[PDB]
Amino acid sequence: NWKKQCKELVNLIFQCEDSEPFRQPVDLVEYPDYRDIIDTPMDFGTVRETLDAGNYDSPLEFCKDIRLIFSNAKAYTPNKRSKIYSMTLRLSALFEEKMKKISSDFK
């Protein structure tokens, strides 16, 4: 059951300290130029909601949206000295480790 596996992984991510800036959509009052840089916003709350609505056709679609969270974060704050950049690298690494098993069990 890939859907329950992906749900467990999203719940795991919400418990990770590094996910805090990615739990909700980026706020456009706080970051007014965000959408001049980012075409397709994404966050873990949205991913959770999409999964619960049954609106991912496969784990690859789920993964693509999670990868988008990280690519967006790195695009908007590209300075590798920044806290957010390091939090993105660490959380990305954990996610990819976990997603590997889900993707195998599927294929």
Curated annotation (Swiss-Prot):
Protein name, per record: Bromodomain and WD repeat-containing protein 1
Domain of life: Eukaryota
Complete-protein stretch covered: 1317 to 1423 of 2320
Annotated S-S bridges: none
Subunit structure comment from the entry: Interacts with SMARCA4.
Segments forming domain Bromo: 1-102
Role: May be a transcriptional activator. May be involved in chromatin remodeling. Plays a role in the regulation of cell morphology and cytoskeletal organization. Required in the control of cell shape.
Tissue specificity note: Ubiquitously expressed. Expressed in respiratory epithelial cells and testis spermatozoa.
Gene, per the UniProt record: BRWD1
Disease cited in the entry: Ciliary dyskinesia, primary, 51: A form of primary ciliary dyskinesia, a disorder characterized by abnormalities of motile cilia. Respiratory infections leading to chronic inflammation and bronchiectasis are recurrent, due to defects in the respiratory cilia. CILD51 is an autosomal recessive form characterized by male infertility due to multiple morphologic abnormalities of the sperm flagella, resulting in severely reduced progressive motility. Affected individuals have recurrent upper and lower respiratory infections, and some exhibit dextrocardia and/or situs inversus.
Locations listed in the record: Cytoplasm; Nucleus; Cell projection, Cilium membrane; Cytoplasm, Cytoskeleton, Flagellum axoneme
